[PDB]
């Protein structure tokens, strides 16, 4: 009946029950002939209630018998199955061999590699699973032959499907890991993986990079330093993580990389901080290049509103304060809120930076017409910016310049007006104990 009524679904409890009856039948002693037919309609058919039913049993199925598991389970000469039945078989076969030893497996691989036989029946992901199975049997446990049977998808004009095309490169990098020094395929896989990298290839290249990452830089004896052009192709004509995850684990291209990275960065906004990590690791591993790099990065973060991590890198590391921070000349309300939350950030982190004592005239010019009106309708920055002010100035015309700016602020008190005026005087008194007594009478009133 299980073979016959398979077309009834595409009277409701039969798929739940008949599979459950065969569930107990194979649980008694073993599974020899009934194990390969109880999956005839289990994983296929798009049932409303046939998920997570048999799934747990396979992980419990593994707990001398699995050594010869391939011959009496896999092939069995079905003459009735198809691509879907083969896929279902390999879903349960992988966990059996993943958890796990005789020398008789050598004849198994010889029979296994004779699958296609001049006929390519596969038109689905069955090729990817076999290559994943091929990687499992090699990494966890004839070498020339398996190279020759994985040939047709290592091209540029055939193997149109990206899934099986990237898997051929995936197995090629997995095999050559220790000492397989060649002249063509050793670098062919390196400059072909990052070609037309789509959004679905990240899950494929993630394991296709770490196998040969600690090997290619150690085997550049016959190389010609032709990695700058390969990096340039993906950074100009085209992700960016493929160029930095190798650096994350661990001079002639820095000049081009800095120019390329500062041009590509201009909803892709979560990459500037990652590039800062790459730059800060270069400095740690090691400033004719970090000068303009940090200036541009502080412009980038100013264009964002990662705030905590970028501030951490700043504290653990001229033209910056002249052309960009002159926004309060015209400013509208939301920009002031962004400015207020931003001036609180970097001004607090420059208290231990030797830059105010070296150059402060440009800083005063940028904030010239910014401090006069930067005391009203702002609650975040104004309430706390005083603490940073007592540790800046402690020479004559400049001193009177902000003194004139200061006196025109708190001499019109006649309540944000009282809040700002009272806070400034506290800052003035905390600047120095000396204070004139020619204006106390106004304060008493």
């Amino acid at each position: 009946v299980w073979v016959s009524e398979n077309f009834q679904e595409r009277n409701w409890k039969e798929p739940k029950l008949l599979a459950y009856c065969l569930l107990n039948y194979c649980k008694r002693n073993y599974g020899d002939i009934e194990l390969l037919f109880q999956l005839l309609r289990a994983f296929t058919g798009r049932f409303l209630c046939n998920m997570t039913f048999l799934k747990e049993y396979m992980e419990e199925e593994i707990p001398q018998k699995r050594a010869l598991f391939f011959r009496f389970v896999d092939f069995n000469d079905p003459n009735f199955g198809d691509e879907l039945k083969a896929k279902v078989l390999q879903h349960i076969l992988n966990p059996a061999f993943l958890y796990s030893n005789p020398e008789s497996i050598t004849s198994v691989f010889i029979t296994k590699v004779l699958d296609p036989e001049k006929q390519a029946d596969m038109l689905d992901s069955l090729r990817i699973y076999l290559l994943q199975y091929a990687t499992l049997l090699v990494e966890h446990a004839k070498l020339r032959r398996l190279m020759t049977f994985a040939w047709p998808c290592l091209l540029s004009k055939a193997c149109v499907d990206p899934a099986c095309k990237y898997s051929g490169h995936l197995l090629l990098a997995h095999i050559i890991a220790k000492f397989a020094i060649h002249k063509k395929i050793v670098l062919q896989v390196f400059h072909s993986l990052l070609k037309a990298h789509a959004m679905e290839a990240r899950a494929i290249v993630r394991q296709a990079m770490a196998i040969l990452t600690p090997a290619v830089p150690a085997r550049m004896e016959d190389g010609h330093q032709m990695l700058t052009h390969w990096t340039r192709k993906i950074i100009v004509e085209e992700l960016v993580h493929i160029l930095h995850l190798i650096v994350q684990h661990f001079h002639h291209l820095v000049q081009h990389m800095v120019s390329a990275m500062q041009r590509l960065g201009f909803e892709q906004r979560r990459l500037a901080v990652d590039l800062s990590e790459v730059v800060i690791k270069w400095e740690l591993q090691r400033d004719k290049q970090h000068t303009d790099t940090v200036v541009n990065f502080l412009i980038r973060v100013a264009c964002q509103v990662l705030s905590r991590r970028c501030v951490n890198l700043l504290k653990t590391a001229s033209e910056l304060k002249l052309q960009w921070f002159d926004k309060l000349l015209m400013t509208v309300n939301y920009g002031n809120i962004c400015t207020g939350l931003e001036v609180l950030s970097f001004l607090l982190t420059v208290l231990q930076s030797p830059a105010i004592l070296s150059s402060f005239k440009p800083l005063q010019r940028g904030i010239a017409a910014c401090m006069t009106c930067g005391n009203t309708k702002v609650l975040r920055a104004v309430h706390s910016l005083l603490s940073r002010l007592m540790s800046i100035f402690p020479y004559e015309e400049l001193e009177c310049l902000y003194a004139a700016v200061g006196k025109v602020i708190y001499e019109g008190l006649t309540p944000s007006q009282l809040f700002g005026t009272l806070m400034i005087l506290k800052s003035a008194c905390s600047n120095n104990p000396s204070y004139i007594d020619r204006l106390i009478s106004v304060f008493m009133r």
């Binding site: 409303l48 689905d124 679905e200």
Partner: protein, 313 residues
């Protein structure tokens, strides 16, 4: 260092040792950037002007001197243009008149350099799209290549239209199937011309459904844009009633991304558009269609392989 090594080879390169001498100017010119637009005003204009005079377009030969064609497009790319492009606009239009690759680079270069200046630019492509569209009967007479791919991105950049509306719904009623790359490119063409919805006769139903049912499942970068475009055309708030009243929703089978790749990444996209399509009208759905709709919706609530965001929706 880069003044006497290039001027003494004007007539030698134009009228054919030369190839190796030309191939070294690939990444050695950007370093020598001492002249800032002061010396290269009229020095470079005759260079590529004579280069395009040579380099015939004989496609029947096995690339006799196409290496020079590759070299000239490699050196033309590294010139940013800001002023004096009127001769350029009178020079770049002579290459799409007749291995079709030289026009792709040129059309890309003018697409990027157009922003800083402003020109009306109405001289040739007023009926050129008509000739391209009427070459389709010649296409089915020959076969059953790289010339009808990018007439629209220029238009999209230009639109930052009555004669264009009529040309849009004409190819959507012909080119019926009675391959390797012809069918993939063929479907790719109607995807672009149906993507324009910035202009706003129920003559588009048959064309759009035929490609959906005959969509090649071997590709992975074709169904993503097709479904995204299908999502955009149902968000007009005015033309969401014309389409769900003629086909009677006979597309309730596995034809919206069947295969292996299309059911893993953009799997939620197909169901989200289908859910949006039902949510549009909610008025002209009979009992039979509602019974089928809930039957399909009762299977997505059990698929525990994808995050439960779709199940909440």
């Amino acid at each position: 260092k880069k003044y006497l090594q290039f001027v003494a080879a004007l007539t030698d390169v134009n009228t054919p040792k030369l190839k190796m001498m030309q191939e070294v100017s690939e990444n050695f010119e950007n370093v020598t950037s001492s002249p800032q637009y002061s010396t290269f005003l009229e020095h470079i204009i005759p260079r590529f002007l004579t280069f395009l005079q040579d380099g015939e377009v004989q496609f029947l030969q096995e690339k006799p001197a196409q290496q020079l064609r590759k070299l000239v497009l490699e050196i033309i790319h590294r010139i940013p243009t800001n002023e004096h492009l009127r001769p350029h606009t009178k020079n770049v239009l002579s290459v799409m008149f007749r291995n079709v690759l030289i026009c792709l680079r040129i059309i890309i270069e003018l697409h990027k350099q157009f922003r800083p200046p402003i020109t009306q630019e109405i001289h040739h492509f007023l009926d050129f799209v008509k000739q391209i569209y009427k070459e389709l009967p010649k296409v089915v007479n020959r076969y059953f290549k790289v010339l009808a791919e990018l007439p629209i991105i220029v238009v999209l950049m230009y639109q930052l239209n009555i004669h264009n509306v009529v040309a849009e719904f004409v190819p959507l009623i012909m080119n019926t199937i009675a391959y390797a790359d012809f069918i993939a490119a063929q479907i790719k063409t109607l995807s672009f011309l149906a993507y324009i919805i910035r202009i706003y006769s129920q003559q588009m139903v048959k064309g759009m459904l035929q490609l959906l049912s005959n969509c090649p499942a071997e590709t992975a970068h074709l169904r993503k844009e097709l479904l995204i475009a299908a999502k955009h055309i149902l968000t007009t708030e005015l033309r969401n009633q014309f389409i769900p009243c003629m086909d009677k929703l006979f597309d309730e089978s596995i034809l919206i991304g069947s295969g292996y790749t299309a059911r893993e990444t953009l799997r939620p996209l197909a169901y989200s558009t289908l859910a949006d399509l039902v949510h549009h009208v909610r008025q002209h759905l009979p009992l039979s269609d509602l019974s089928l709709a809930v039957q399909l919706f009762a299977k997505n609530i059990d698929d525990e392989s994808l995050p439960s965001s779709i199940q909440t929706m």
